Design a protein around this ligand. Sequence first.
Ligand SMILES: Nc1ncnc2c1ncn2[C@@H]1O[C@H](COP(=O)(O)OP(=O)(O)OP(=O)(O)O)[C@@H](O)[C@H]1O
Ligand SMILES: Nc1ncnc2c1ncn2[C@@H]1O[C@H](COP(=O)(O)OP(=O)(O)O)[C@@H](O)[C@H]1O
Lengths: 291, 889, 393, 395
Amino acid sequence: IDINDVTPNCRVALRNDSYTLHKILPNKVDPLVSLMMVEKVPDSTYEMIGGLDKQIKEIKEVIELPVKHPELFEALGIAQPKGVLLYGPPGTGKTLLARAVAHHTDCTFIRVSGSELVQKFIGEGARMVRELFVMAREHAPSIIFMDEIDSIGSSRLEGGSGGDSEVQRTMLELLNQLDGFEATKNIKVIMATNRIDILDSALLRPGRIDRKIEFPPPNEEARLDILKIHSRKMNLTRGINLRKIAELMPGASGAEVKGVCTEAGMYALRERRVHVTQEDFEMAVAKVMQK
Amino acid sequence: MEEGGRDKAPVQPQQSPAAAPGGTDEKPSGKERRDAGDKDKEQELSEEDKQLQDELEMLVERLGEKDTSLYRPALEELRRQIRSSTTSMTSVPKPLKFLRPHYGKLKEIYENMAPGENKRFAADIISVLAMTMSGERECLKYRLVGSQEELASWGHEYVRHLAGEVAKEWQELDDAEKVQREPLLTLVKEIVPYNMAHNAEHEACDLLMEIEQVDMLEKDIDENAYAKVCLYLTSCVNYVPEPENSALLRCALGVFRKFSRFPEALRLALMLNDMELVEDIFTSCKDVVVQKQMAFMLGRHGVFLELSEDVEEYEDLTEIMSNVQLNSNFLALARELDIMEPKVPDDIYKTHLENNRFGGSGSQVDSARMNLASSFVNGFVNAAFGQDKLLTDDGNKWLYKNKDHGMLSAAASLGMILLWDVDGGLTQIDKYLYSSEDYIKSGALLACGIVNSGVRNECDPALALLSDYVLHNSNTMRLGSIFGLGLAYAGSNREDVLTLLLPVMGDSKSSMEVAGVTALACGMIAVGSCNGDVTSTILQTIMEKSETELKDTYARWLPLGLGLNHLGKGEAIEAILAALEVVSEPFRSFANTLVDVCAYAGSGNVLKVQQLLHICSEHFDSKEKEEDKDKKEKKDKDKKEAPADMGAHQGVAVLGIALIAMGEEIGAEMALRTFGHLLRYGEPTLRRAVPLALALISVSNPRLNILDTLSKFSHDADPEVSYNSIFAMGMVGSGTNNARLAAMLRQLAQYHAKDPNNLFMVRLAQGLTHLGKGTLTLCPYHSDRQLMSQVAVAGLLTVLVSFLDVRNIILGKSHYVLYGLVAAMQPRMLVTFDEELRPLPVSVRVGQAVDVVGQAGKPKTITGFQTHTTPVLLAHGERAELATEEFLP
Amino acid sequence: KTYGQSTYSRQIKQVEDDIQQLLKKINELTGIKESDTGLAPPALWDLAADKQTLQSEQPLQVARCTKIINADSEDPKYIINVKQFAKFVVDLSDQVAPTDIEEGMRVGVDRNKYQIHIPLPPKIDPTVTMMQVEEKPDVTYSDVGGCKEQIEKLREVVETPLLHPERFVNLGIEPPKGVLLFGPPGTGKTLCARAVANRTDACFIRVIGSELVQKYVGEGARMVRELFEMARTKKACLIFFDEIDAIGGARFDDGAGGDNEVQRTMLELINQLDGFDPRGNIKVLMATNRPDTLDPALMRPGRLDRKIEFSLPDLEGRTHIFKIHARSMSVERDIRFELLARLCPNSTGAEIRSVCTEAGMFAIRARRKIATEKDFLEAVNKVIKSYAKFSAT
Amino acid sequence: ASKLPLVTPHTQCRLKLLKLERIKDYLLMEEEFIRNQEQMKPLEEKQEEERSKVDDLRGTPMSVGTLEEIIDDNHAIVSTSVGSEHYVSILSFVDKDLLEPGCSVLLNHKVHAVIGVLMDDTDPLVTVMKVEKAPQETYADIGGLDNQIQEIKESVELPLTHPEYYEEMGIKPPKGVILYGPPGTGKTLLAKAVANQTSATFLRVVGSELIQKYLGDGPKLVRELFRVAEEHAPSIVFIDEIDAIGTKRYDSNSGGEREIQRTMLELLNQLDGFDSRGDVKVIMATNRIETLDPALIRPGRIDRKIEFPLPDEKTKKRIFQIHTSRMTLADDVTLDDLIMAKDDLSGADIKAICTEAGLMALRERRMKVTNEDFKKSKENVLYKKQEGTPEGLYL
Ligand SMILES: Nc1ncnc2c1ncn2[C@@H]1O[C@H](COP(=O)(O)OP(=O)(O)OP(=O)(O)O)[C@@H](O)[C@H]1O
Ligand SMILES: Nc1ncnc2c1ncn2[C@@H]1O[C@H](COP(=O)(O)OP(=O)(O)O)[C@@H](O)[C@H]1O
């Protein structure tokens, strides 16, 4: 065997009597690349999503303009932002706006699940923020979408004197790779989260992150748009009159609409039909609203 | 950058260069006053020195550096009233462009201006950016001039006065923490003629206040150890009038005036006795001075006082300087009965009660060499009245049985057991003087010599008993019979024992070991300048050495004595009479080096040290010339001990790297005795680096290449925790091997660290660092060591008791007038202060506050408290006295 | 071109700068191994590759350590456990006698025959051995002057029984083994503690007052247990506590859902201090700035017998602190200190030490070797104005 | 390594020049001999036989472990991989100077005697609360505080770069510096600007971090913070917002509100309570003065009380000069009249003006700078600074 081919983290065989390196076994997989964060061609909404028009203008003037106008930022001498924080009640344009922005800015969309399945091998997060960013640096001009979980992963360095569970170190690793040297280049990040006041954005404020955009509970127009989006991949009848279903329930979040569609499919299945009728949606609204 | 505008400096001080070319002629008012209106402002702004950057320190400087050449010679009105800035751009606005001493050339012209700035510009000139120019111009200009241009161009006439008034001003201004700048300015100025300006500084300190006089004094002792040879010859004599004429401390000087004993002359070596004689202020303080002339460095004048019962308290001064009974034995007794255990029944060699159960069984060693080593061990630790009557009966039966060498070395046990008890010890030795064995009787004669070592008794019992045996027979008993006179009378100079021991030395007797031991006596009876003994030694050498090409025994003892005649004062004037006549035969390059670079003790002259290795480094000698480099290696043991860890760590850096790992024979056999001669207290550097090349026995050659290194590694006294290394080294060299050539040398080399209970002094640095004999006696103890062939036949007798120069290592007593106190002292580590703010803690080791009058070991500085002034020596080393009345509770 | 510090202050830089790299040249010319994954210099392990390691390998086996639990009668027959391997019943070897073989200390056991070879010192966790001071700071009693009555009271409590156990035996009294120190901050409690640890002739053990407050339940009682056992092992140690309010003085119950664990630690301390075979010849020093929120069990004598107080000196002790703090200076022998103590009415020793440092600050702000007499007078007047402002805000 | 202790006088003092001249003679005599040594015996036998002998003397399976206690100079009790502990003997090719209770050592497979010591991995606490490199550039970007820079210059930088002045008259440098002022003036900022001209490492901690929900990790984190800083270098610890914890102690009511008093008493004892640590310089930033514990305020812990006033107009020109330096500026926009009538701003607000005045130009896709860009930036930042304070009655 040869010394140079021996790397960190490769399985090797040791002999029985005296521990000498017998043969390098082949590795099985890199765990993060096995579960790799799926790059998609971004299927936008084509920006018809009403009600979030203020959010459309704000996300335009906040994140799109640095990508499209490096000349304006260079002429004005303004440092281009790196990250964008989003917050609000769940379901109110968490992932939809990022997809629409990514497709309209001519960039690919990357979604990072990364909640706890990565951190099972304790320090995989310390490589999760590494290799992901490597692909986001090597693939194309793109954006990175990352959820609340990092704030779930760490708040501050109280675990530095407490243990860090090798997760805050992960945050720390992300910290330097969030700082690095980009100046837009080809990689940008968008933060979507809830309960913003647990993480450590005061140190994250100089240079690393920038202006944050709120989200309200959805209006009737955004409710109908969410219902029309989530009724796409469903074999349904024509003439469903989704506006009637939109006015049928008074007011709710966007998370219950998905349950409305699945249990509407349930009630359609109990009718022993491939149809999804209007009365299925009426009983769907009634049963979901009940809970 | 707002520099400019608001400040005047770019406008009016830069308009000021307009009146030397354009106002010297046609403007008598404009000759000076046009310039003077801003020039007095510049002088006032320059005397006020708070900023690095003044409005005239760097702003007018830009034209100032060429203004000293284009404008100042173009002033053409240089007078007394122009000495406000044109006396001051050198001791005030220094220029920016500095090309080495360019201001050295500028201040040739400015030297006549320098009396213009004499008084108003005296204060802030030995501070800020002016004293660099002042000191460097003084030093370099006097270096260039010297005294060859004495009357020529005032380069010695006014420069001496300027340095004198600057040195006066150094304590006139502040008496700062840079008092030691005052020697420095009198140093580089007047390197060779140093004495005149240094006596000017000494008269300035005669005008100075008498409490600062300590600190410059120890600054002088800081420079009276390693400066330059001709600088010793003036600095050690420039110490002399300062605490004698100005101050009247008159005891802190004589403890530190033995530095000037040997390098200057014997006249100054005895003027300590002279000005101790002519000073007669009461009795006590001078009694403290003669308490170290007792026997603590050299007795010398211990028979020089009595004339016609003229000296006040003569009979007490003589009882002190003689070391005799109540000033020694009583004290040691007063400790050993009252602070220690007086039993010590060889339990140091009986503490191995857990070793014959280790590894099976025992009772395998049957060699007849352990008996002698155990005899020496049990006779070694029973010092100070631990007389083991009816315990040496194994030695008594071994007197008449075997080991004639051991029978001689066992009879010295009672002699080395009553050391300094001259009055009681003779009565215990008497019983052996009538023995039917020549070995026992010779060992009892050697015991009588040992008991008197360092004690001058009015009855001369050593001379009076040993005299009759010096010429007794031609055989071995002829050999040893001188040796008592060689030991008890080695620190003095009397002609009677010299002409006593001379005829064996000058009869051309061909028994070489007799001649060697008589030379080892007679060449160091007086460590002085006895030319007759020198001629006798060299003639007796050229009397049998020439017609042979044989072993080192020829050079073992006789050239050692010829070196010992002037050792410690060998300033390379001994070379021209000793070495230059003895260049006859080439086989003894050992001896030629031994008498050639014999020289003297720890001093400077590092060019001799690099001569000792630069020429004869290794030379790849084929076992024919390496003995020259052997001696030249043991010369490197000296020049390092007395400078007090100056080159000592440099020494162990060199031979702990260069020679121990790269030596072919010398570094592995002979170059390890230096750890015993350089140092003796033991620290985890050297006492652990010595077994690193000793735990390997190196059995390729005969095994005693390592046993001598074991003896030198455990040669350090002052009992310690070294029992683990000692016992492990015993068990790796135990009855598994138990080599007979090292069978006695093993047991000698293991348990002799705790040699005496507390009398462990073999340092040879008394007070602070002065030598005090000893090394002359210590040299045959480890220089005669040449592995085997001397522990059995001839050579052991010289290495028996030649190291007996212990000088009462007890570090606690009172001696309050007639011993009226107990006192509470404070032992603490070496003097960490050299130059800071004037009072300071001397050391940082807390103090470990002990009332009990106990020893301190080697490295300590023991101060007092409880308002008792410690008024007698101000050097904190324990001798005596400790008077009272600080008028304070 | 440049500027020089003092005389030949530039060629000294070269002559000590060339030799420092020439030492590296010496080292590389010899050839020195660098960072051999944990090893020794070749002139330092020259006996390691020798018969020293062969004597370190053949006779001495592993002698794997064990803990003893119970001893039998007549025949030794010790019950033992290793650490986690198993428990056994064993005998001692012939190399050691059966006297220092009592229950409850670690003993070494041969790995083959399972025989006891050599006892070991007992297991002490490293968090309580680090607080053993192992060195003494040098603070002479002459450096804590101005507090003569308090100093002699602390002296006659602590130093006299540990150095003269003759007076109290013939007079038949007992010394107060517990003394509390209190007063305003920065008055000399720390200096008195260092002065006690100066000449103690004994073992001194310091305690950080908030060290015992720990995350898990009951471990602070274990620290107090191991601390007092280490005190009992040696002879005549001195316990020093600092900032005793952290350990606990209150006994609140007003809806007692707050601190209870630190009350348990205080209670285990309170019990180990006194009662049911007391500690012996140990002494306890305590110090706090608010001795009014303390436990009445602590203030009961038999545990705390003297309440030594401190205060804003006098007029004379300010002069004494001036004479002992500003003596390490380069000032001309003309400064009068009683006027300077008159100008500052109410001050601590720390303020006087701060005056002494600001004197050097004035000496350094201007380019002077020393702080001259008028310079010292201007400096002290400016810092008196500055300290009036500083006490104002 | 420990060439000699040959520095006694710490001044000019030619004996020091002689001692360094005395030290070179043994050095030049050594390089002369070693050069003569190599030409005669070039055999590097230390790496030939001895390094090969020890490599076979050490067992080829090296079993790692953990040290627990050093019993004596030849035997030390070590642990093993899982549970067992032994009484193996320390050898003599292992360095004992960095042998500490805690670092991993490695044993052979038969006798289990310790061969050596594996390199200790550095603590992760260094990586997190370090200030990394310069978060802001040098003193060109800060405005005019003048003497505020001067006091920190002579107390933090001057003992570091030039330690040839304080020991001359033998005065120990002051330890603690405290910075106070109105909320937003220069507080920490200046603290970031001093952490680029410094030579040693800089550790930043925040007082908001210095609470713990677990009773006990409070004083432990403070102790571990200073232990890391002391062993490294002559480092500097900066406790930002220290006034959040050590404000007062008079409440003494049950809960975490008295635990804060307990977690500050350890900081008070570890600052100066016993054997004060060498070469560690502290610096503390507060917002308020009067609600502070007077035992901190006393000397011995902090000495340099530094005041931060708000500059009215003069440095405000230079603050505006710095903040508008790396951007365009037109002729119509001039900043002098925007601050002419106002004398109640702060340096945080000026940057808040200049960042937002560039935000209108980007959001409107307009020209570089207009004068009305600065006019409405001043009005809105005033709305952000002074919004709803109920003062119609002037107290
Ligand atoms: N009598 C004194 N003589 C000399 N120095 C004193 C004296 N009193 C106080 N000091 C000085 O005060 C400094 C600080 O006070 P110290 O450390 O003794 O505080 P303390 O009284 O223990 O208070 P706290 O624990 O409440 O902070 C010490 O370093 C010491 O130099
Ligand atoms: N003189 C100045 N020069 C440059 N920037 C300044 C100046 N004064 C204040 N600032 C800005 O004001 C902000 C506040 O600094 P600081 O008071 O230390 O923070 P905080 O108000 O959070 O304590 C800094 O980010 C700094 O950029």
